[PDB]
Amino acid sequence: GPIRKVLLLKEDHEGLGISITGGKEHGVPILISEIHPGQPADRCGGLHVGDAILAVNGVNLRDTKHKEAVTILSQQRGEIEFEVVYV
């Protein structure tokens, strides 16, 4: 589908509220495999299971390994912009 821009708001005491799978070393994008109920990704309304995360806060994720993506994603704080696409 279309590439979309999505805003997520979170406080410092929370995680993002997602599970991810995939990564470059597996030949798979960074994919959302879970949205956890009531946590910031669920509350922002625009992120869904099956979405590929293309970038976060302008940091490209298309060619990142799994653990690289985890470090990058877990470093972001507050008002966070995602670039995602559902295939």
Partner: peptide, 7 residues
């Protein structure tokens, strides 16, 4: 087979 991480 693919890893999953909660974040």
């Amino acid at each position: 087979r693919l890893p999953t991480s909660k974040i």
